[PDB]
Ligand binder design. Structure first.
Ligand code: JHZ
Ligand code: SAH
Ligand code: ZN
Length: 404
């Protein structure tokens, strides 16, 4: 496969087998026919970009009934509001500032911008969550951001001072088109800022469930620096974030317009020192992934043989990789509890575990809950103290399989 950033050769290091769409939740009576694709991950030989080897077409993932609602997490709501206030205090202080968000979802970030009276536009090609943002008074276009739609916004609205994307840029294999988009639309002195799951964290935590249809790229500072530079931008800041299992927020500016913070060089040097993107490191990760599969299935089967009940918690997109790679279905984990109405009373993809409202996780509790939404551990466990007090325990598989 050719690298989507530079056209280099991509070498595979992990093959997770045949997988369903991660965000497709079927009614129980639907035909058992699903779209499947081969999920495998490689690294570009030339620019070090780690990326999937098969693309899922955008319209199969993102469309009218896409079910992920960002605002379902209190930690994320606070995280995005704070980011919005930071932009309002720094990059959006001009006379007539403009901010564009790629992937605004339900408006989790842009509601703060809208509440400050700042001109803005959200790109949200999934119309059901777009309408939730529009109900908050946010300006949203139900389109994918790409060269042409960026051109159209530049023609009608002028340059954006900030273009921001969270948990969205890594989903877009046509990143070159997005970057052309950014070049057409960003002010000469603006910034393109994006935050996504960090390769460093994935490798350290063996958090392979971060790999699924919607995560095409696993960005690093080294690869993002290369990608920027090849397109006339420059990586000028990096910030590590705890959300979503570990992320980096990357700040890109037009080349030479701003001087990189010391943080960029320091993270580049740590990745080079730790051999983050070396093929050998990435294969060692792939072998750790198999070890986690084998320990998790051994545990789940032992639990069953010992007459212990087991459910899951959080109908994450990520969990589709776990259940389908590991072969875990309703035999072993009888239900998954989730707060999203459009995932409730439906079956998880590929493995077909029933999803039930989180309100149903109550006395009498199961013996064990497999914590799919482990990136939300603290928020979830805080709301489920009674479960743990009653003696129920969590099963985690990041960074290793363990119960607590
Ligand atoms: C906080 C909380 C969540 N839950 C439930 C709600 C969600 O269905 C799921 C968590 O999904 P969560 O880890 O955020 O994203 P997912 O892996 O799906 O990934 C999705 C798809 C996507 C865009 N590709 C991505 O990268 C991230 C940003 O979002 O867990 C509770 O039940 N109780 C709670 O208290
Ligand atoms: N080319 C593109 N432009 C804009 N949004 C896109 C896109 N491709 C996918 N999306 C949107 O990207 C969103 C990813 S979900 C992440 C939402 C939010 N920023 C958060 O961090 O929680 C989805 O709502 C999807 O519809
Ligand atoms: Zn490349």
């Amino acid at each position: 496969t050719a690298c989507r950033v530079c056209g280099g050769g991509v070498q595979e290091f992990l093959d997770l087998g045949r997988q369903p769409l991660s965000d497709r939740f079927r009614k129980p009576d639907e035909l058992d026919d699903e779209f499947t694709y081969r999920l495998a991950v490689g690294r570009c030989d030339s620019c070090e970009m780690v990326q999937l080897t098969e693309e899922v077409p955008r319209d199969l993932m993102f469309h009218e009934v896409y079910p992920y609602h960002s605002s379902g997490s209190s930690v994320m709501r606070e995280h995005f509001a704070m980011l919005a206030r930071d932009f309002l205090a720094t990059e959006l202080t001009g006379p007539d500032p403009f901010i564009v968000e790629i992937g605004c979802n339900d408006g989790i970030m842009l509601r703060t911008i809208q509440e400050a009276g700042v001109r803005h536009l959200g790109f949200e090609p999934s119309s059901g969550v777009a309408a939730k943002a529009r109900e908050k008074g946010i300006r949203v276009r139900t389109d994918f951001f790409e060269k042409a739609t960026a051109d159209d916004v530049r023609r009608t609205e002028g340059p954006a001072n900030v273009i921001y994307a969270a948990n969205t840029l890594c989903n877009i294999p046509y990143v070159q088109s997005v970057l052309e988009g950014v070049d057409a639309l960003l002010a000469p002195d603006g910034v393109f800022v994006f935050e996504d799951p960090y390769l460093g964290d994935i490798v350290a935590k063996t958090s392979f469930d971060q790999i699924y249809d919607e995560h095409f790229f696993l960005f690093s500072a080294t690869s993002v620096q290369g990608m920027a530079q090849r397109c006339g931008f420059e990586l000028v800041d990096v910030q590590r974030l705890p959300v979503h299992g570990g992320e980096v927020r990357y700040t890109l500016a037009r080349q030479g317009s701003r001087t990189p913070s010391a943080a960029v060089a320091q993270l580049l040097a740590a990745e080079r020192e730790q051999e983050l993107s070396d093929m050998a490191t990435l294969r060692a990760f792939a072998g750790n992934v198999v070890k986690i599969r084998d320990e998790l299935t051994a545990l789940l089967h032992r639990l069953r043989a010992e007459g212990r009940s087991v459910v899951g918690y959080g109908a994450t997109a990520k969990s589709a990789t776990v259940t389908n790679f590991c072969g875990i279905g309703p035999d072993l984990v009888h239900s998954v509890y989730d707060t999203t109405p459009d995932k409730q009373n439906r079956l998880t993809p590929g493995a077909h575990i029933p999803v039930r409202p989180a309100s149903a996780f109550s006395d009498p509790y199961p013996d064990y809950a497999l914590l799919f939404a482990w990136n939300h551990a603290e928020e979830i466990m805080a709301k489920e103290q009674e479960f743990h007090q009653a003696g129920g325990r969590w099963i985690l598989y990041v960074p290793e399989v363990h119960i607590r």
